[PDB]
């Protein structure tokens, strides 16, 4: 009942299932000598560590949260240092979301992971700037969660890989994400493939007022590799 991955280990979970997004794992670049032919360094022992983020607060009037996954780890730790002085990467992720409330709370979350989530501004003709997208570690907040901030409805948002956190039954979710991009290797400082988003469908309630019910998100790059920084001559 623990996830010992490298240096750190998130211990003592509830029973959980590795629901692979779609049907695949990271795979480590099977054969491309036609592109960027300086063999990828492929670091493996010094990146896989479950970078746990800040705990967020779930109150009655809360409305949703979103993180951009290559963006949330650009300034954190050993993966954050390899984003500078490298310009190509290739990695898949693993996400473990776990809230904790007693047996007197009630509610439901939708933990969904959205590939290529192009956002949209409400009621204007101007595209979103650089600062409304690259928020960072803190993430963001849905302004209009019913339309997922781009017009496509939430009722059909179960077509993506998703799990439910229903506080009557469970309090944990786990999604494994493969490399979802058209190009074989991508640029980390300006493109964001996945977009982890959690949305409370049924809001919480109790007899007293505004119980926090804090949530924890933990992200770990699975099978990462970068360009080569060391060459013979």
């Amino acid at each position: 009942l623990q996830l010992k991955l490298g240096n750190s280990a998130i211990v003592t979970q509830e029973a959980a299932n590795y629901c692979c997004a779609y049907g695949e794992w990271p795979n480590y670049l099977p054969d491309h000598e036609a592109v960027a032919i300086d063999k990828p360094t492929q670091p493996e022992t010094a990146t896989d560590r479950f970078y746990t983020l800040k705990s967020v607060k779930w109150e009655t009037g809360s409305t949703g949260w979103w993180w951009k996954l290559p963006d949330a780890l650009n300034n954190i730790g050993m993966f954050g240092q390899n984003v500078q002085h490298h310009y190509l990467y290739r990695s898949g992720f693993l996400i473990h979301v776990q809230c904790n409330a007693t047996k007197f709370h009630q509610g439901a979350l939708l933990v969904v992971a959205i590939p290529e989530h192009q956002r949209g501004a409400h009621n204007t003709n101007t595209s979103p700037g650089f600062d409304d997208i690259m928020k960072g570690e803190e993430g963001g907040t849905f302004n209009h969660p019913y339309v997922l901030d781009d017009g496509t409805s939430l009722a059909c948002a179960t077509i993506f890989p998703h799990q439910w956190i229903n506080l009557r039954t469970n309090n944990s979710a786990t999604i494994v994400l493969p490399w979802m991009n058209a190009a074989p290797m991508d640029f980390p400082l300006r493109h964001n493939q996945w977009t982890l988003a959690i949305i409370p469908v049924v809001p919480l309630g109790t007899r007293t007022t505004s119980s926090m019910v804090p949530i924890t998100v933990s992200i770990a790059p699975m099978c990462c590799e970068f360009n080569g920084l060391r060459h013979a001559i």
Partner: antibody, heavy 116, light 96 residues
Framework: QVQLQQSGTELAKPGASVKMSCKAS????????MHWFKQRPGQGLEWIGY????????DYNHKFKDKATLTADKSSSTAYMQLSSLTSEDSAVYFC?????????????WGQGTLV | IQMIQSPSSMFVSLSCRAS??????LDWYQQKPGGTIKLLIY???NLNSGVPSRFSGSGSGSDYSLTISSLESEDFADYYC?????????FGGGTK
């Protein structure tokens, strides 16, 4: 380090309104409630209300329902409070405190005060 | 709800009653004459991190009190109470 820096003092003729600010720095602003207090000079204190900057829900004391309004800004990390229809008995010092992560009312960080 | 604090001035057990029961849920504050406020006791018996350990609080259903063993020069400050049980939350009168 948690700091609650309020504005300098100001005064106004009766029949007007006034707005103050309690700028906070050193923590994540959208997690804690921002309570506001009132102390007449020489007496005890009194609870006015709070603002929830994660949701912008406010809850006022029953005496101060029509006097004060409460807002909160996320970008500038600053909580405001605007009075209305000032009289002679509004001359007091006004405080601002911080709640807890779990929504309990025990105050460990405070402002310096602002006379009216 | 109204809370009354029985001594009006002090010249060292400062007690305060309550109109109802509050089930713990009481804090003790202090105000320096410069204008700084920090709490001393939270949840009627515990001590804040960074206080001299001579302070202590009693516990009951409705009648709570503070106990100071020895006195000091800058110990001289007006002491307040607070119930956080039900909104609107009310202070007390204060001593000294």
């Amino acid at each position: 380090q948690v700091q609650l820096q309020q504005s300098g003092t100001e005064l106004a003729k009766p029949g007007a309104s006034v707005k103050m600010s309690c700028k906070a720095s050193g923590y994540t602003f959208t997690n804690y409630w921002m309570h506001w207090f009132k102390q007449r000079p020489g007496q005890g204190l009194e609870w006015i209300g709070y603002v929830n900057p994660n949701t912008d829900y406010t809850d006022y004391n029953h005496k101060f329902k029509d006097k004060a309004t409460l807002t909160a800004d996320k970008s500038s990390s600053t909580a405001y409070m605007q009075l209305s229809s000032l009289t002679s008995e509004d001359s007091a010092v006004y405080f601002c405190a911080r709640g807890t992560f779990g929504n309990y009312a025990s105050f460990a960080y405070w402002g310096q005060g602002t006379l009216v | 709800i109204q809370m009354i604090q029985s001594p009006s001035s002090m010249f060292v057990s400062l007690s305060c009653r309550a109109s109802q029961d509050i089930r713990g849920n009481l804090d003790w504050y202090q105000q320096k004459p410069g204008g700084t406020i920090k709490l001393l006791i939270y949840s009627t018996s515990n001590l804040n991190s960074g206080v001299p350990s001579r302070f202590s609080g009693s516990g009951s259903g409705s009648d709570y009190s503070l106990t100071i063993s020895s006195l000091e020069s800058e110990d001289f400050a007006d002491y307040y109470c607070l119930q956080r049980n039900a909104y609107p939350l009310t202070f007390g009168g204060g001593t000294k």
